[PDB]
C-alpha cells in the first residue's frame, strides 16, 4: 500500500531501431 | 454433383467484355479513390465509433481516480 | 430484336496506342505483350532469389 | 484424353480447389481462414526442433531453453518464432469467428458445431504447454488452475493427484504435460480435415445474404492469386514484430529459474486468456465459479436457434448493427480489467461486463429482431 | 391502439425504409428474404413473367458490390410503388403445413 | 542513493535506497569515485564507470542484438520491391471482369 | 509511332517459352552480385567508428 | 431414408469395407495385409513411451 519510483528515460546510445553497440 | 452444368435457370439476358491486353489497368486511380472513401466513411463513422466511445470515459475515470487514491493517500491519512 | 445491336463504347478504357479506330492493331501488338509480361518476368526472378 | 479428369488422384484436387463454383463478391474477410492453415503448418514444423533438445528433467528443464537460446546455430530465431507465431494464431481466431456472427454463417449447423470443439482443443494446448518452460509463472499458474478442478465435491480429490504423479510438481508431472503437447496437436489436424467435407455440398456464402447460383466464377485464376497475395502479406508483420521488438508481447518473469522459495507478486497470464479468467475470479463460490467459466464456449451452440429475423446478415439491418459493436467493446473492457490488481471500481466494473456479455445475446438480440420485422412487414 | 398519433408512426416507417439500403442497390423488399424450405416452394409457383424479373434484378444488384459503386439517385426504387408480389404465394404454403400437423397430432 | 528521511526506522545492516520496493536493501554502496583505474587513459568518474558497467551487462543478457538489426534490414529492402510485383500480376487477371455491361431484353 | 523497349524485348527474348523461363534465372545472378554491397555499405556508413572492425586497427599485426 | 447412404461421412466407410464386391474363393494367404496393418499400429504406441521417458 505504498508508492514506487519509476526510473526516467535517457537517450541511450543503442536505443534506436537501426543503431548499434559501442564496442569500447 | 453440383458442377457448372446444372444450376439455376435464366433467360433473355446478355453481357459484353474486352480482353486485358487491349486496356490499361489504372483508369484515374488517384482521382476516384478519394471520393469513394469520402462518401462511405461518413455513413459508418457514426456506426462504429459511438459504441466504442463509451470506453474512453470509464477507462480514464478509473485510471485517474485510482492514481489519486494511490499517489495521494497521505491527503486523507490525517494525523 | 435481332439485327439491332451496337456494342457500347469502350473508348475511355483503351490503351492510348489503340484508341484510334482508324488504324489497325497488328502494328500495335508487340509493345503490349512485351510490357505486360515483364511484371511476371521480374516476378519469377524474385521468387527464385 | 483429359488427364485432369480421369486419374484417381487428380479428380480429388480438381473437384476441391481448382474447379469449384465460387461467388463473386466475397469480402476480404473470407480471406483469413486460409491464413490459419499457414499458421498450422508452421507451429507444427518449428515445434519439433525444440522437443529434439528439451529435457523433461524437473531440475534440468529451465537450463535447457537457456542453452538453446544461446548455444546452437540460429536457435534464437526459432525460439522466438515459436513463442510469437501463436500470439497471432490466436489473432486469427477472433476474426474468423466474429464474422460468422455478421454474415449469418451459423445456419450451417454441421459446419458450425464441428467448430466449437476445435476452439476448445486449441485453447487448451497452449495452457497445457506454457507451463513447461518451467519457470515461476509456469508453476504458479499450474497450481492455481489445478486447485479449482479439485473443488468438485466428490470428483476433486482423486483426479488432481493423477496429473501430478504425487502431491506437487516433480519429475512425475513435467513428463506427462510434455506428454500432452505432442498429441493434442496431431489430433486437432484431423478435425480440421473434416470441417471442409461439410463445406462441399453447400458452397460458400456472399456478403449480401442471397443465394447466387446464377453467377458463379471458378476458384482458379481468381481465388488462387488473391490468396497468395494476402498470405505473403502476413510475413511482413510477423517478421517485423519478431525481429524488431520481440520482448513486447511477453513478461519478464520466465527468467528466474523455477523455485518454490519465491512467489511472483502480480501473477497474470498472457493477454489472450485474461478474458475467460476475468469472469472466474469476478465471483465468489469456487464450485460455481468453475461452471461460469465454461458457460462461454458452450454459450455458442445455443445460438443458431435463437434467430428471430427474416433476412440474413446485418447489411440490411441497420438497427441491429448497434448491438454488435457493444459486444466487442465489452470484450475489450473485460480484457483491460483482468491483467491488473484488485481495487475499488475494478470489482464493480468488471462485474457489468460479466452481466452484459449475457444480457446482449441472451435477452436483447432475440427481442430486438422483431421490432424491425414489424417495420418491413417481414 | 392510437390513430391520431399513428400519423407520427407512419413517419418512422418512411425513416427505416431509408435507413436499410436495399433501395439504393435497385431492389424491392421481397428480393431480400432468407429462403428456408417454406420459401423454396412458393418460388416454384411463380408465373414466368415474374420469375425472370427477379433474376435480372438480383444479378445486376450483386455485381455493383464487387465494383463498389451505387446507382444514380433518380434510379432508386421509390417508396410507394414497391410491390409485395410474393405475400400471396407464401401465405398458402404455411397454411397447409399446419394442417398436416393437426392431423398427425390429434 | 540518499540519506534516510526523518522519523523512519531502519535495520542495522540496512541502508537507505529510494529505488527499492522495500525502500531499503542490504547493498552496502560498492561504487564511487576512483575505486578502479581505467587502463585506457580515462578519468574514472562514478557516472562513466556505471555507464560502462550497464552497457556491458545488457550485452551479457542478450548478445544477439547486433546480428539481429542487420537481417531486420536486409529483409525490408528485398521484400519492399518484390511485393509491388504480385499486385501487378493480380490486376491483370481481375481486369478481365471489371469491364462488362449487362443488358436485358425480354 | 516509334516502338518502345517492350516491343523489341518481346521480339527478342519473351515469345519463346523456352527463353522466358531462363532470364528469371538471370536476375538472381545479378541481384546476388549487386545487393550485398548495396546493403552493407549503407549499414556500415550509418554507424561508423563503433564496431570492432573500426577499432581493431589499434591491435592488428602489432 | 437409409442413413448410411445419404450421410456425407458414413457414405465413405460404407463403400470401402462394409459393402464392396469380394471374391468367393479368397484363401488365408490373403490375411497378411491386414496383419501388417495391425503390425504397423503397435509400433507407434509402443515407441511413444520409449521417447517420453527416453
Ligand atoms: C494480419 C493482422 C490482422 C489485422 C488486420 C487488420 C484488418 C485487415 C482487414 O482485413 O480489413 C480489410 C479492409 C480491406 O478493405 P476492403 O477490401 O475494401 O473491404 C473490406 C471491408 O470489410 C469493407 O468495408 P467498406 O469498404 O464497405 O467500408 C468500410 C470502411 C472503409 O473501408 C475502406 O474503404 C478501407 C480502404 C480505404 C483505402 C485506404 C487507403 C489508405 C488510407 O469504413 C468504415 O466503416 C470504418 C469506420 C470509419 C473509419 C474510416 C477509415 C477508412 C480509411 O481493410 C480496411 O477496411 C481498412 C480499415 C479497417 C482498419 C481498422 C483498424 C482500426 C485501428
Ligand atoms: C478482443 C481481443 C482481440 C483484438 C483484435 C482486434 C479486433 C478489431 C477488429 C477491427 C474491426 C474494426 C474496424 C473495421 C472497419 C469497418 O468498420 O468496416 C465496416 C464494415 C462494413 O461492412 P458492410 O458489409 O459493408 O455492411 C454494410 C455497411 N453499410 O463492417 C464490417 O465489416 C463488420 C465485420 C465484423 C468483424 C468483427 C470483428 C471482431 C469483433 C468480435 C465481436 C465479439 C466476438 C465474441 C467472440 C468471443 C470468443 C472468441
Ligand atoms: C497447435 C499447436 C501448438 C501450439 C499452439 C503450441 C504452443 C506452445 C507454446 C505457447 C509454447 C511456449 C514456448 C515458450 O513460451 O517458450 C510451447 C512450447 C513447446 N511446445 Fe508447443 N505448441 C503447439 C504444438 C506443438 C507440437 C506439435 C509439439 C511437438 C510435437 C510441441 C512441442 C513443444 C515443446 C517441446 C515446447 C517447449 C520448448 C520451449 O519451451 O522452448 N508443441 N508450445
Ligand atoms: C483450427 C481452427 C479452425 C480452422 C483451421 C478453420 C478453418 C476454416 C476454413 C479453411 C474455412 C473455409 C474457408 C473460408 O470460409 O474462408 C472455415 C469456415 C468456417 N469456419 Fe472454421 N476454422 C477453425 C475454427 C473455427 C471455429 C472456432 C469456428 C467457430 C464457430 C469456425 C466456424 C466456421 C464457419 C461458420 C465457417 C463458414 C465460413 C462461411 O461463411 O462460408 N471455425 N473455417
Distance (Å, whole) CA D350 – CA D335: 9
Q: What cell numbers appear for D239 in the block?
A: 517478421
Pocket lining for ligand 1, CB < 6 angstroms: B 37, 40-41, 44-45, 48; D 27-29, 91, 234, 237
- Which residues of B fall within a CB distance of 8 Å from C19? none
Residue linked to cell 505432442: D182
- For residue D170, indicate whether it is catalytic: no
- Which residues of F fall within a CB distance of 8 Å from D262? none
Report the Cα B14 to chain-centroid distance in Å: 36
Q: Binding site membership of F: which residues?
A: 26-27
Tell me whether A22 touches chain G (CB under 8 Å). yes
Distance (Å, whole) CA D225 – CA D36: 17
Which value, to the nearest 10 degrees, does the dihedral of the CA atoms of residues E54, E55, E59, E62 take? Answer: 40
Q: Who's near D298: CB < 8 A, 6+ residues apart?
A: D116
CB D207 within 8 A of CB D313: yes
Q: Binding site membership of F for heme c: which residues?
A: 26-27
**Best CA proximity match to D360, nearest among D336, D317, D335, D325:** D325
- Which residues of F fall within a CB distance of 8 Å from A2? 23
The ligand with the least distance to the CA atom of B33 is 1
The ligand with the least distance to the CA atom of D321 is 2
Three-state secondary structure readout of chain E: CCCCCHHHHHHHHHHHHHHCCCCCCCCCHHHCCCCCCCCCCCCCCCCCCCHHHHHHHHHHHHHCCCCCCCCCHHHCCCCCCCCCCCHHHHCCHHHHHHHHHHHHHC
Chain interruptions in chain F, by residue before each (C–N > 2.5 Å): none
Tell me whether E64 touches chain D (CB under 8 Å). no
- For residue D53, indicate whether it is catalytic: no
E contact test, residue of D208, D214, D308 with most E CBs within 10 A: D208
Exactly one of D171, D216, D220, D226 is catalytic; name it. D226
Three-state secondary structure readout of chain D: CCHHHCCCCHHHHHHHHHCCCECCCCCHHHHHHHHHHHHHHHHHHHHHHHHCCCCCCCCCHHHHHHHHHHHCCCHHHHHHHHHHCCCCHHHHHHHHHHHHHCCCCCCCHHHHHHHHHHHHHHHHHHHHCCCCCCEHHHHHHHHHHHHHHCCCCCCHHHHHHHHHCCCCCCHHHHHHHHHHHHHHHHHHHHHHHHHCCCCCCCCCCCCCCCCCCCCCECCCHHHHHHHHHHHCCHHHHHHHHHHHCHHHCCCCCCCCECCCCCCCCCCCCCHHHCHHHHCHHHCCCHHHHHHHHHCCCCCHHHCCCCCCCCCCCCCCCCCCHHHHHHHHHHHHHHHHHHCCCCCHHHHHHHHHHHHHHHHHHHHHHHHCCCCCCCCCCC
Q: What cell numbers appear for G8 in the block?
A: 523489341
Distance (Å, whole) CA D13 – CA D15: 5
- Plot region of D313 (φ>0 → left; ψ -120 to 50 → alpha; else → beta): left
Residues of A at the B interface (Cβ-Cβ below 8 Å)? 1, 3
- For residue D227, indicate whether it is catalytic: yes
Whether chains C and H touch (3+ CB pairs under 8 A) is answered by: no
Q: Binding site membership of D for a ubiquinone: which residues?
A: 200
DSSP state of F24: E
CB-closest option in D208, D318, D372 to E62: D208
Q: Which helix (H) or strand (E) holds G27?
A: helix G20-46
Phi, psi of F15 (to 5 degrees): -125, 140
DSSP state of B73: G
- For residue D211, indicate whether it is catalytic: no
CB contact under 8 A, H8 and D201: yes
CB contact under 8 A, A24 and G55: yes
- Largest CA-CA distance found in chain H, in angstroms, rounded: 53
- Which residues of D fall within a CB distance of 8 Å from H8? 197-198, 201
Atom number of ligand 3 nearest to Cα D79: 41
- For residue D200, indicate whether it is catalytic: yes
**Best CA proximity match to D82, nearest among D142, D126, D118:** D126
Helices (H), H1-54: 3-6, 10-13, 32-52
The ligand with the least distance to the CA atom of D276 is 2
Sign of torsion, CA D134 D136 D139 D142? negative
DSSP state of G62: -
Q: Who's near D75: CB < 8 A, 6+ residues apart?
A: D68, D69
Cα radius of gyration (chain F): 32
Neighbours of chain C (3+ CB pairs under 8 A): B, F, G
Which experimental technique did the depositors report for determining this structure?
Answer: cryo-EM
CB F102 within 8 A of CB B15: yes
CB contact under 8 A, F89 and C10: no
CB contact under 8 A, F102 and E60: yes
CB E49 within 8 A of CB F91: no
Amino acid at each position: 500500500t505504498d508508492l514506487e519510483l519509476h526510473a526516467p528515460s535517457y537517450p541511450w546510445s543503442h536505443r534506436g531501431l537501426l543503431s548499434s553497440l559501442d564496442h569500447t | 454433383g453440383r458442377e457448372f452444368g446444372h444450376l439455376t435457370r435464366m433467360r433473355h439476358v446478355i453481357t459484353y467484355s474486352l480482353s486485358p491486353f487491349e486496356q490499361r489497368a489504372f483508369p484515374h486511380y488517384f482521382t476516384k479513390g478519394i471520393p469513394n472513401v469520402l462518401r462511405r466513411t461518413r455513413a459508418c463513422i457514426l456506426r462504429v465509433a459511438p459504441p466504442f466511445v463509451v470506453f474512453y470515459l470509464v477507462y480514464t475515470w478509473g485510471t485517474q481516480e485510482f492514481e489519486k487514491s494511490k499517489r495521494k493517500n497521505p491527503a486523507a491519512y490525517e494525523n | 430484336s435481332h439485327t439491332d445491336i451496337r456494342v457500347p463504347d469502350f473508348s475511355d478504357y483503351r490503351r492510348a496506342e489503340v484508341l484510334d479506330s482508324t488504324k489497325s492493331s497488328k502494328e500495335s501488338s508487340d509493345a503490349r505483350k512485351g510490357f505486360s509480361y515483364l511484371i511476371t518476368a521480374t516476378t519469377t526472378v524474385g521468387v527464385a532469389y | 484424353t483429359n488427364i485432369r479428369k480421369s486419374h484417381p488422384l487428380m479428380k480429388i484436387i480438381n473437384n476441391a480447389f481448382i474447379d469449384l463454383p465460387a461467388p463473386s463478391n466475397i469480402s476480404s474477410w473470407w480471406n483469413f481462414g486460409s491464413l490459419l492453415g499457414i499458421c498450422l503448418i508452421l507451429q507444427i514444423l518449428t515445434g519439433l526442433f525444440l522437443a529434439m533438445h528439451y529435457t523433461s528433467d524437473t531440475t534440468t528443464a529451465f537450463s535447457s531453453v537457456t542453452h538453446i537460446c544461446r548455444d546452437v546455430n540460429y536457435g534464437w530465431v526459432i525460439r522466438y518464432l515459436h513463442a510469437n507465431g501463436a500470439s497471432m494464431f490466436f489473432i486469427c481466431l477472433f476474426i474468423h469467428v466474429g464474422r460468422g456472427l455478421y454474415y449469418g454463417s451459423y445456419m450451417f449447423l454441421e459446419t458450425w458445431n464441428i467448430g466449437v470443439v476445435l476452439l476448445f482443443t486449441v485453447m487448451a494446448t497452449a495452457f497445457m504447454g506454457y507451463v513447461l518452460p518451467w519457470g515461476q509463472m509456469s508453476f504458479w499458474g499450474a497450481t492455481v488452475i489445478t486447485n479449482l478442478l479439485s473443488a468438485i465435491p466428490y470428483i476433486g480429490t482423486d483426479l488432481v493427484e493423477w496429473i501430478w504423479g504425487g502431491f506437487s510438481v516433480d519429475k512425475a508431472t513435467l513428463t506427462r504435460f510434455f506428454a500432452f503437447h505432442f498429441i493434442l496437436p496431431f489430433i486437432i489436424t484431423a478435425l480440421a480435415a473434416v470441417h471442409l467435407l461439410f463445406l462441399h455440398e453447400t458452397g460458400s456464402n456472399n456478403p449480401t445474404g442471397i443465394s447466387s447460383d446464377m453467377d458463379k466464377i471458378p476458384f482458379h485464376p481468381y481465388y488462387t492469386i488473391k490468396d497468395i497475395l494476402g498470405a505473403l502479406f502476413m510475413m511482413l508483420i510477423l517478421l517485423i514484430l519478431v525481429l524488431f521488438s520481440p520482448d513486447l508481447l511477453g513478461d519478464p518473469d520466465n527468467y528466474t529459474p523455477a523455485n518454490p522459495l519465491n512467489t511472483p507478486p502480480h501473477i497474470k497470464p498472457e493477454w489472450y486468456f485474461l478474458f475467460a479468467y476475468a469472469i472466474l475470479r469476478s465471483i465468489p463460490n469456487k464450485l460455481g465459479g468453475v461452471l461460469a467459466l465454461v458457460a462461454s464456449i458452450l454459450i455458442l451452440i445455443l445460438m443458431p436457434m435463437l434467430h428471430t429475423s427474416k433476412q440474413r446478415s446485418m447489411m440490411f439491418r441497420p438497427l441491429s448493427q448497434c448491438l454488435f459493436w457493444m459486444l466487442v467493446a465489452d470484450l475489450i473492457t473485460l480484457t483491460w480489467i483482468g491483467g491488473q490488481p484488485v481495487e475499488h471500481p475494478f470489482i464493480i466494473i468488471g462485474q457489468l461486463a460479466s452481466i452484459l456479455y449475457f444480457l446482449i445475446i441472451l435477452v436483447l438480440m432475440p427481442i430486438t429482431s422483431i421490432i424491425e420485422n414489424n417495420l418491413l412487414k417481414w | 391502439a392510437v390513430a391520431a398519433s399513428s400519423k407520427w408512426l407512419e413517419g418512422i416507417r418512411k425513416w427505416y425504409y431509408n435507413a436499410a439500403g436495399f433501395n439504393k442497390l435497385g431492389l424491392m423488399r421481397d428480393d431480400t428474404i432468407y429462403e428456408d424450405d417454406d420459401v423454396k416452394e412458393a418460388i416454384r409457383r411463380l408465373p414466368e413473367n415474374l420469375y425472370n424479373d427477379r433474376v435480372f434484378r438480383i444479378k445486376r444488384a450483386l455485381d455493383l458490390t464487387m465494383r463498389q459503386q451505387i446507382l444514380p439517385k433518380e434510379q432508386w426504387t421509390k417508396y410507394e410503388e414497391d410491390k409485395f408480389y410474393l405475400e400471396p404465394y407464401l401465405k398458402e404454403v404455411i397454411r397447409e403445413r399446419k394442417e398436416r400437423e393437426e392431423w398427425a397430432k390429434k | 542513493y540518499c540519506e534516510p528521511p526523518t522519523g523512519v526506522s531502519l535495520r542495522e545492516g540496512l541502508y537507505f535506497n529510494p529505488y527499492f520496493p522495500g525502500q531499503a536493501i542490504a547493498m552496502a554502496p560498492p561504487i564511487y569515485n576512483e575505486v578502479l583505474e581505467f587502463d585506457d587513459g580515462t578519468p574514472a568518474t562514478m557516472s562513466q564507470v556505471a555507464k560502462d558497467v550497464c552497457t556491458f551487462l545488457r550485452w551479457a543478457s542478450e548478445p544477439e542484438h547486433d546480428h539481429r538489426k542487420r537481417m531486420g534490414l536486409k529483409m525490408l529492402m528485398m521484400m519492399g520491391l518484390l511485393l509491388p510485383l504480385v499486385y501487378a500480376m493480380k490486376r491483370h487477371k481481375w481486369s478481365v471482369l471489371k469491364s462488362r455491361k449487362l443488358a436485358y431484353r425480354p | 509511332a516509334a516502338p518502345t523497349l517492350t516491343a523489341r524485348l518481346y521480339s527478342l527474348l519473351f515469345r519463346r517459352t523456352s527463353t522466358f523461363a531462363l532470364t528469371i534465372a538471370v536476375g538472381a545472378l545479378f541481384f546476388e552480385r549487386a545487393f550485398d554491397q548495396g546493403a552493407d555499405a549503407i549499414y556500415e556508413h550509418i554507424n561508423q567508428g563503433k564496431l570492432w572492425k573500426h577499432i581493431k586497427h589499434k591491435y592488428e599485426n602489432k
